[PDB]
Design an enzyme around this catalytic site. Structure first.
Site: not given
Ligand SMILES: [Mn+2]
Ligand SMILES: [Mn+2]
Lengths: 151, 128
Positions: A127, A62, A123, A60
Site C-alpha cells: 500500500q 467443527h 498486500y 468434536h
Molecule cells: Mn476433530
DNA sequence: AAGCCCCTAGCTTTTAGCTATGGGG
DNA sequence: AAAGCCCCTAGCTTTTAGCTATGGGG
C-alpha cells in the site's frame, strides 16, 4: 469471496469453531449427532449465521461459519451450545443423568479468509507505494478483488 | 499462526480492517499519518490487540490485527476510530475545521487465517 | 496456550446451561 | 451507490467528542 454488509460495515467473517462435550465423552454419535446438527442449523438460521460447513467427530463438532463481526462470534457460540445442551439433555436422558453439563466452558476459534495470512500481510505492506507485487499468477484473483474493493 | 487464549477460549482471530477519512479526503499524510499510526499502537497496547501490519494510503488505513473473540473486533475499531478522531482533531486544526468528523460511520473487515477458505472447508469435510 | 473443580451475574435454553480480553485452585 | 452522502436515537469514550448498533430513514 463474497462480501455482505450490515447498516455500517462491509465484511467477510468466516470462523472455524470447534468445541467438545464435557470430559470429551464420545457422545456425539447416532441420533445425538444428527439432532445436534439440526439444532445448530436452526440456531444459525435465526441468528442470521451462515454455516458453510459443519461436521461432527465423536467428541468434536467443527463448524465453519460466516458471522456478522458486529453481532459477535461468541454470541453465536453461546447460543448454539446453550440451546443444544438444553434440548439434547431433554431428549437424550443419558446426557442428563450421566453428565453435569453437555459441554465445556471452552472452545477453539480460528479466523479464515480467501488467502493465507502472508499474502494479506504482503498486500498491506505494498500500500505505501502500490507499484506491483509481480508474483506470477499465484493469488492474483484475491489481490485483484481487494484493490477493486478499495478504490 | 500461534494460538492465544483468554480464560476460556483458545483463538486466532486476525482481521484485515480498512477505513477512510470523511469524504475520502487524502488527508492521512505527513505529521497526521505518523500520529495516527502512533495512536493506533497506543490503543492496541491498551486493548491487548496485536497489530501485525498497518499501512496508510492517503484516504485509507489498513490494519491487520489479532483480536480476542470475546473482546470484539468492533470494540477495537470504535475505540481506534473514536480516540484517533478526538486526538488528531485536537492536534491538527485543519482536520477539525475542514471536516465535520475525521472518519465515517463505516469500515471494511475481512477475516484471515493460516489457510485459505476451501482448504479449511475440505479439512472439515474430512472429519466424518 | 481450553479441556478438571468451584464461583457470579447476565441472558437464554429459564425447575437450563453457557458466557466473561471474568476469577481462583 | 451505500459503506462511503444526509439525518436520528442511543450507548460509551474520546465526553466544550465522535464513533458505534446483525440500528434505521432518505
Ligand atoms: Mn476433530
Ligand atoms: Mn446508516
Amino acid at each position: 469471496v463474497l462480501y455482505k454488509s450490515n447498516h455500517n460495515v462491509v465484511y467477510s467473517c468466516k470462523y472455524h469453531i470447534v468445541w467438545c462435550p464435557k470430559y470429551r465423552r464420545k457422545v456425539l454419535v447416532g441420533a445425538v449427532e444428527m439432532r445436534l446438527k439440526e439444532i445448530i442449523q436452526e440456531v444459525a438460521k435465526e441468528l442470521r449465521v451462515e454455516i458453510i460447513e459443519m461436521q461432527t467427530d465423536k467428541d468434536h463438532i467443527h463448524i465453519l461459519a460466516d458471522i456478522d463481526p458486529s453481532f459477535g462470534v461468541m454470541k453465536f457460540i453461546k447460543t448454539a451450545k446453550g440451546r443444544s445442551s438444553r434440548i439434547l439433555r431433554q431428549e437424550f436422558n443419558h446426557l442428563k443423568t450421566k453428565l453435569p453439563t453437555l459441554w465445556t466452558n471452552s472452545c477453539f476459534i480460528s479466523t479464515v479468509g480467501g488467502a493465507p495470512l502472508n499474502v494479506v500481510k504482503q498486500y498491506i505492506e505494498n500500500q505505501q507505494n502500490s507499484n506491483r507485487p509481480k508474483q506470477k499468477e499465484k493469488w492474483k484473483s484475491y489481490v485483484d478483488n481487494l484493490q477493486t474493493k478499495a478504490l
